């Protein structure tokens, strides 16, 4: 429909601790907007099956912020694999967002794409190598006019499309508060 090589890809994961080489994604949820920002579809949400022996890595944080969430039972009872995720998440993709030409959309969004290296190859590729991370602009923010941060606020629950619908609220945001364009 809205097809464009203009759309933007957001994505969010959740995982089993900070370090690729150690840890897990145990969710991914994937949105894509128009180059206005404009949501256009949601993508698959997605708890990733892993077996206890990765979820006995989970430091506090993790473990009590997966687990009041909720995360942690749908994981425990979820039956797809990072391939099978990965797969119902180009399968999406295709349909809205040519390959190769979407940044990766996020917040931070450098540690996500650390983690698709190494654990999804095959999706990191469809992005186009550069990263629009809406940190940057609250990090600029915070240095040149720092009163504007205390207008928008986020619930940060760490359920991965919630989140990632606030990545696009927060560069919404700062469309119409720092930016003249
Ligand atoms: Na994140």
Redo the contacts with the bound molecule.
């Keep these: 429909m809205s097809f464009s090589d203009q759309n933007l890809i957001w994505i969010?994961?959740?995982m089993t601790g900070l370090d690729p080489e150690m840890h897990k994604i145990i969710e991914m949820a994937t949105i894509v907007t128009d180059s206005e920002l404009n949501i256009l579809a949601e993508g698959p949400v997605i708890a990733i099956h892993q077996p206890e022996s990765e979820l006995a890595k989970m430091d506090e944080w993790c473990t009590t912020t997966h687990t009041a969430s909720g995360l942690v039972a749908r994981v425990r009872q979820s039956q797809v694999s990072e391939e099978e995720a990965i797969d119902q998440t180009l399968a999406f993709l295709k349909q809205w967002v040519p390959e190769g030409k979407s940044p990766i959309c996020?917040?931070?969004?450098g540690?996500?794409r650390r983690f698709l290296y190494k654990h999804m190859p095959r999706l990191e590729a469809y992005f186009h190598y550069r990263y629009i991370d809406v940190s940057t602009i609250k990090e600029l923010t915070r240095r040149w006019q720092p009163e504007v941060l205390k207008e928008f606020s986020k619930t940060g629950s760490?359920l991965?499309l919630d989140?990632?619908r606030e990545?696009i609220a927060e560069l919404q945001f700062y469309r119409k508060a720092v930016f003249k364009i």
Aim: proline share 0%.
């Design positions: 969010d994961l959740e996020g917040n931070s969004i540690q996500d760490h991965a989140d990632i990545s």
